[PDB]
Amino acid sequence: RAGDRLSGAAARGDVQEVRRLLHRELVHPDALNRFGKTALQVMMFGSTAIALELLKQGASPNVQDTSGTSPVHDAARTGFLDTLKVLVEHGADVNVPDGTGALPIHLAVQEGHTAVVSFLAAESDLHRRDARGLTPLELALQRGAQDLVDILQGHM
Predict the structure, then answer these.
(1) Which helix (H) or strand (E) holds 142?
(2) All structural domains of the chain with their residue ranges
(3) Residue 110: which of 155, 64, 73, 69 has the closest Cα?
(4) Are 51 and 45 in contact (CB under 8 A)?
(5) CATH assignment of 1-156?
(6) CB 156 within 8 A of CB 138
(7) DSSP character string of 35-91
(8) CA distances from 81 to 2, 42, 62, 77, 115 (A)
(9) What is the distance between the alpha carbons of residues 143 and 80, in angstroms, rounded to a whole number?
């Protein structure tokens, strides 16, 4: 149940409860909830403080579920740039594809997150193709997202 409580507090965005669990009860940030997930996997990605608190206490950033999804994929897809920056700062790989063949940059392109695409562009392998055979520049272009094309052409 420590893993369920920490996951639950993180998913609700309760920063004070997350601090209490980590710093007073001394729950390890990788404690598993009942469905085998860590708090970093199910957190409210808008709560940057929760991500950094977990990472400073030793959470593993590269955790991945069986669909190949890690916290960086979900942070990029949902547009939470401040949280993505803390994840990358603490060692999260942004070049690992999910089970759809998508990097975090492909997900941000699909959803139209311009600031995230800009951040990830000089960091990502832009020749990687997803299941549909598209590179991130080709996915932009298909969608007609000219601001994303403009950014990606600058990186190749």
Answers:
(1) helix 136-142
(2) 1-156
(3) 73
(4) yes
(5) 1.25.40.20
(6) no
(7) TS--HHHHS-TT-HHHHHHHHHTT--TT---TTS--HHHHHHHTT-HHHHHHHHHTT
(8) 29, 17, 17, 10, 7
(9) 21
Q: Which residues contact residue 100 at a Cβ distance below 8 angstroms, ignoring those fewer than 6 apart?
A: 68, 130, 131
How far, in Å, CA of 87 to CA of 21, rounded? 21
Pairwise CA distance, residues 127 & 105, whole Å? 11
Please state, in angstroms and rounded to a whole number, the distance separating the CA atoms of residues 22 and 39. Answer: 11
Single-letter residue type at 142? Q
- DSSP-based three-state secondary structure for 75: helix
Task: Check if the beta carbon of residue 88 is closer than 8 Å to that of residue 123.
Answer: yes
- Nearest in space to 128 (alpha carbons), one of 109, 105, 145: 105
Contact 15, 44 (CB under 8 A): no
Way the structure was solved:
X-ray
> Which residue matches tokens 């997803």?
130
Phi/psi zone of residue 21: left (φ > 0), alpha (ψ -120 to 50 degrees), beta?
A: alpha
Q: How does DSSP classify residue 22?
A: I
